[PDB]
Structures are given as C-alpha cells and as structure tokens.
Structure 1
Amino acid sequence: LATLKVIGVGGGGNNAVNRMIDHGMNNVEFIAINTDGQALNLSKAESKIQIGEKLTRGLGAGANPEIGKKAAEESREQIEDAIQGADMVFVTSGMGGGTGTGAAPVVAKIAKEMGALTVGVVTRPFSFEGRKRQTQAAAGVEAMKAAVDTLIVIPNDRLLDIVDKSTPMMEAFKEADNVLRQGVQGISDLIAVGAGLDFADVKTIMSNQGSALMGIGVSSGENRAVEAAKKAISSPLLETSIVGAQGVLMNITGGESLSLFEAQEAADIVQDAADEDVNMIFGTVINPELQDEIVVTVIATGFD
C-alpha cells in the first residue's frame, strides 16, 4: 500500500477537492482546510479542519496570508494528526488568497517534517484579479517551494484559451479545479494501480526537486499512443521546454487494449523531448471503462 492524502487549503483549494470527489477519485483520502467555517461546511470531504479559531473566529482570513500563516501554526496539532500515517501528501490550493497563500506552506512543511512525500499542486491567479493578488501569489509560490518536495504551478491565464468565452466570472475557475484534479490524479493513480513502477521509484524522481511542469495528452486511433504523448509534451499548460528536466514521470492511462509496445512508443516520444541524461520513470494505468481512448500525463521535475 501507500497512504495518499490530498489536503485542500482555502476557498479554491476546497472547491478543487469537491471536484475531485464528484469526479470519483478513490485511491486518495481528502482533507479540507480553511479559516472560513461556512465554506468548510460545504466541503464534501470526509475530514474538515477549522484553523485559527481563537484568531479569526471562523470568518475567513480576509485575503491576508499573514493571518492564514499563524492560523495554521495555531492549529498545527490538528494538522499534524490529520497528516498522520501518510506516505505522501498532496497540498492543493489557490495562490493569492489569505488562508491558501499563508497556511498551505505551513501544511506542507508539517507534512514534509513528518516524513511524507509532499507535493504541492497550486495555481497562479488570473491576471485580471489584480496586482495585489499577483504579488501575494508569487510570494505564496516561493514559500511553497521551500516547504514541499515538488511544486506544480498552473497559471490560470494559461487556461484562458481553453475557457469557453461564454463563461461567467463565477464559473471561471471550473477549469482550474479540473487541472488540479488531473495534477493529483495523474500522479496518485500511477502509485495505486500503475504497473511498471512503484512508490519508491516516484519518491526518487520527486524528492527535493522543486518546480515541476505537467502536460496532458488525450487521443484515440491507430497510433493513439504517439499522438497522445505528442500532445502532452506540447500541451499549453507548461512553459514548453521540458528539456530542462532531470526527471520525468509518465502516466499512460488506457483501457484493456493498452499494450506495452504502445506505452513504450509513447515513452520514447517524451524521452526524445527531454535531456538525454534524464531519469525517466513511467507506468501503465488500466481503466477498463475506456475502450480506445488513452490519456498520457507527464510530470517533468528536477529543474533548475
């Protein structure tokens, strides 16, 4: 086994967790974290932790990371016992808020302290949200880098091209929750069901690496594997030059038709796009609910 815990920190972070529940992830345990008592109620997670009750009285962090920072420090023990037993902890949050920007780095440090492989999956706010949010988020990012083994950062502006253009600003973060689900699912599924690798290989590629890029490719057809890999390494989601990688993790999820030769033909594509001296590790995830559709996920770490 491997105990995989996903911890949502903040408003958007918890919205992502709900989205993961409704999507039907099962290899993972979900924790909700917020200084907002009301929004925490709306968490579909099995475990909810109110933080900083004596400091904020359950009313939200008012968009100041500093408040979120001590709120988590004040409730360290409750965080500590939630993270308990986890071989690996995902911290997912939106950067630029209060509870998220401030507390998530704390949640990450505690988890990494306890000896869990700690991966952060976060977003940069939209550009239109303003300079304050931007700066607050940049500080939020950097804080996380020092608190996690591996940080995945997804700018919301990079999703703006795949937003409908017929979308209210209320629904504007439904693509962020989606990618956050994919970010977590792509890795977690590799550990649980994946063949061809195992948890110890993932710890090697991911411990103390720093920033990581993620790319996803979906395809079906005669040479579906190659096309799916080709989409993943040319995905919009990353600043494209994965070539800087000193580590690559690959998830090829498919149906029962998915063969080894197909996997390899897709693994070769990714390897040719990265440094020749890259430590590549990849695995096969079987989802029988798929017939011909294949999903390739690459996480490039170790840079730089």
Structure 2
Amino acid sequence: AVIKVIGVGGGGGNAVEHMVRERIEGVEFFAVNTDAQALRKTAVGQTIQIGSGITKGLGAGANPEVGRNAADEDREALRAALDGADMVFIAAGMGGGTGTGAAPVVAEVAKDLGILTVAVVTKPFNFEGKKRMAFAEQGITELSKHVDSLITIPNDKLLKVLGRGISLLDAFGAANDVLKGAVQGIAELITRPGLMNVDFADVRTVMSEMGYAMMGSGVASGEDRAEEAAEMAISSPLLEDIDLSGARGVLVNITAGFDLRLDEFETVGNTIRAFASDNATVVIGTSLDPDMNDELRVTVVATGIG
C-alpha cells in the first residue's frame, strides 16, 4: 500500500510536522505551500511549492483565491507527487489563503487520479474572527466536492475542552493531535495490521464517496481495556452528538501491542456493532504497535453522517 499524507498551507504543514514527529507507520509525508521559507524550514521530507511565491499586495495571500490559483497553476507538480498512491490524506487549517484555496485543488487532483481521498481539516478558533471563519466554511464547501470523506475539526470545540492559560502553540497542538489521530487511525489498519488484517476494499467501502465523517478515540489498560477503550471512543467529545446508528459506515482501528487478544477484537467489534446500524458497513481492524504493552486504543471513524 502506498499512502501519502499532504499538509497544505501553514496550518496543515504544522499538523503534518506533528505526524512526522510522533510517527505514522508506512506513510509518505508531503508539504504543499506557497511559502518557500516554510518549505525550507519543515522536517517533512517532500515539499511542493505552488504558485512560485508571487503576491500582489501586503497580506493579499490571506485570500483563498491566491491558494486556489497557486495550486491550479501547479496541478502538474501535484499530480506527479500524488500519482501511484492507493490513498491520500489531505490535512489543512482552513481559514487562511493557501489551505483554504489549495486543499480542494489538491483533493481534486487526487480524486481525478482515482485515489481514495480523505481530508482532515480544521476550522479556526472563534477569536480568529469572522472573516477567517467565513473563508474556512467556503473552502470546506469546495473541498467536499472533491474528496471521498471529509472530517472537519472545529478548533473552537477543542479550545473549550482545554481551558486554562494554554499557549497558542498548545492550542494548535491539540488540533494537530486530532488530525494525527484520524490519519493514523485509518492508515495504520493498512500499513501495520495486528492479528486481524482489514481488506482494503472494505476501507474503500466505508470511506469512498461518503461525505461527512467524524473520528473519536479512546484508550484503556487492564483486564477490561477493550470494552473501556471502545466506550471512551464512542463517548468522546467529537463523536458524542453523532448518532452512530445513522452512519452509513463505521471504521474501527484497535491498536495495541503484541498482547492483543482475539477475544478483545471480538469484544470491540460487538460493542461497535451494538451502536451501529445493520443498514451500514462496519469494518473492524487491528494495528500492531510493539511499543504498547498494557494500553489499548480504539479509534472510531463514523462516515456517511448527515
């Protein structure tokens, strides 16, 4: 499996840098930006400059029009980077000029190539202002036209569960971890399975041409960890208002060490199928993280929600 993760713009590039640091098994990372300096800074091993860096006016690059035109002009470079992938993840912070405008073009290029294309993006914090929130939603409207699944993370919802005198860096770190959670949860079912390997056709079925999606995750240790982690995932703040019996698809990743047991696989699957519909596709897989000993994580991606 060839899986590529593309960070688009400053925010997405920061999120993908977090994914590089904290590791996602068996994926290739890319950063796509108008900002040549940013691409020079980044730890991402593959970079793609779009638009070659021409602005017209101080702050003119905050307009999504600029990101869209830049990616439009460099569609051939994007296609050469994406081609050969079985799956593409697009990460972006929506609301700025580059991510908002260029992420839907990156998605369109991937989708036109026949690649299963999953976007995981954020909306700005409320304190960033109404102009950025409006740009973000307009970009998400365009992005939804060109992806198989779209997971939109409201940064403002993350901010409320963080409180305190958190730094802005940690505020964006919280969004980064959610984005990583979603990408890693989907991709590692393919790139490093555990005792139960998912068929890629099933991943395609739950994610393909599905529209809106949402991710929740949970972790637990000890004897009841499998049921505990599944329940925490189901009840996480991101999934709590999703009726899981209204999701057209559910993809579940159980991640644990070598000591994952078959009966734990069965428990998690039975729990998830108790909340989902039989008129839905439910896919349960495992990933192996040899560094985990006692802990078990369940990540749930609900797709085709409305």
Common fold by TM > 0.5? yes
Name the residue aligned to 1:291.
293
SS at the partner of 1:190? helix
Instruction: Indicate if the aligned counterparts of 2:252 and 2:284 stay in contact, CA closer than 8 A.
Output: yes
Q: How far does residue 37 in structure 1 lie from its aligned partner after superposition?
A: 1.2
Separation of aligned partners in 1, 2:235 and 2:13: 29
What secondary structure is seen at the aligned counterpart in 1 of 2:118?
Answer: strand
SS class of match (2:171)? coil
Which residue is 1:228 aligned to?
A: 229
Deviation at residue 124 of structure 1 after TM alignment: 1.1
Alpha-carbon distance change, 269 to 61 in structure 1, aligned in 2, over 3 angstroms: farther
Task: Say if 1:61 and 1:293 are closer, same or farther in 2 by CA, change over 3 A.
Answer: farther
TM-score scaled by length of structure 2: 0.94
Taking structure 1 as the reference length, the TM-score comes to: 0.95
1:187-235 CA distance string (max 9 Å, x none): 1100112233121211111110011010101111221101100010111
Q: Secondary structure at the match of 1:214?
A: strand
- SS of the equivalent of 1:167 reads coil
Aligned CA-pair RMSD: 1.6
Post-superposition shift, 1:246? 1.1
2:213 corresponds to 1:212: yes
C-alpha separation in 1, matches of 2:28 and 2:186: 14
Alignment partner of 1:51 is 2:50 = yes
Q: Is the 8 A contact 2:25 2:191 kept in 1?
A: no
> Could you tell me which residue of structure 2 aligns to residue 129 of structure 1?
128
How far the C-alpha of 1:244 sits from its partner, in A, is 1.6
Provide structure 2 residue ranges, at least 5 long, that are not aligned to the other structure: none
Kept in 1, the 8 Å contact 2:55–2:61? The answer is no
Corresponding residue for residue 300 of structure 1: 302
Give the match for residue 14 of structure 1. 13
Query: Residues of 1 paired with 2:79 and 2:59: CA distance?
Result: 21
Supply the distance in 2 between the matched residues of 1:124 and 1:271 (Cα, whole angstroms): 31
Q: For structure 1, list consecutive stretches of 5 or more residues without a partner in the other structure.
A: none
In structure 1, the partner of 2:78 is 79
Q: 1:93 to 1:54 in 2, by over 3 A?
A: closer
Which one is further off, 167-176 or 62-71?
Answer: 167-176
Q: Distance in 2 between matches of 1:10 and 1:278?
A: 35
Aligned position for 2:243: 241
Q: Distance in 2 between matches of 1:186 and 1:232?
A: 12
Q: Is the contact between residue 92 and residue 122 of structure 2 (CA under 8 Å) also seen in structure 1?
A: yes
Cα shift readout 1:83-125 (whole Å, capped 9, x = no counterpart): 0111111110011111000000000000010111000010111
Q: Say yes or no: does 1:88 pair with 2:61.
A: no
Q: Once the 2 structures are TM-superposed, how far is the Cα of residue 240 of structure 1 from its aligned partner? A: 3.3
- Counterpart-to-counterpart distance in 2, 1:54 and 1:291: 47
Give every structure 1 segment of 4 or more consecutive aligned residues whose post-TM-superposition deviation is greater than 3 Å.
54-57
SS at match of 1:40: helix
Cross-structure match for 2:192: 193
Question: What are the superposed Cα offsets for residues 49-99 of structure 1, whole Å, 9 maximum, x if unpaired?
Answer: 111126439x98621101110100001111110001111111100111110
Is the 1:35–1:60 contact (alpha carbons within 8 Å) kept by the matching residues of 2? no
Partner of 2:153: 154
Find the residue that maps to 1:159 and give its secondary structure: helix
Higher normalized helix content (fraction of residues):
2
Could you say which residue in structure 2 is the equivalent of 1:163? 162
Structure 1 residue 165: Cα displacement:
1.3
CA contact (8 A) 1:60 1:99 kept: no
Moved more, 234-243 or 117-126: 234-243
Please tell me whether the aligned partners of residues 219 and 295 of structure 1 are also in contact (alpha carbons under 8 angstroms): yes
Q: Does the CA-based 8 Å contact 2:103-2:143 persist in structure 1?
A: yes
Cα distance in 1 for residues equivalent to 2:168 and 2:205: 40
Identity of aligned residues (%): 52
Check the 8 A contact 2:119/2:151 in 1, yes or no. Answer: yes
Distance 1:245 1:42, change over 3 A: same
1:35 is matched with 34
**Residue equivalent to 1:253:** 255
Aligned partner of 2:107: which letter?
Answer: A
SS of the aligned residue for 1:175 comes to helix
